[PDB]
Every structure is written in C-alpha cells, then in structure tokens.
C-alpha cells in the first residue's frame, strides 16, 4: 500500500508580543 | 494494498507578529 | 493487500494573532 497521509496542520500559534 | 494511517498532527505555530 | 506506511507527521500550524 501508498504511505499514508500527512498529518493534519498544528494549531495557530501563540498571540505575539503586545 | 490500503493506504497507511494517517500522520499525526503538527505542533503549535509560531507567535503571531508585535 | 499490505497497509501502507504510516503517514508523515503535519506541518507546524500558521503564526498566532497579534
């Protein structure tokens, strides 16, 4: 069998600095 | 033959921009 | 027939907010 697929994405990161 | 699982999730994202 | 490999884990998730 093909591999299987890529993971979904992460989650959004972090609010940057203020 | 069938497709492997799927990958699992990515991490988190980096901050956000100031 | 034979499963696939395991997929690859996903991408790092897209930047936070500001």
Known sequence: ???G???LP???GPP???
């Open 5 to 7: 697929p890529p993971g």
């Open 1 to 3: 069998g093909p591999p």
């Open 16 to 18: 940057g600095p203020p």
């Open 10 to 12: 992460g989650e959004a």
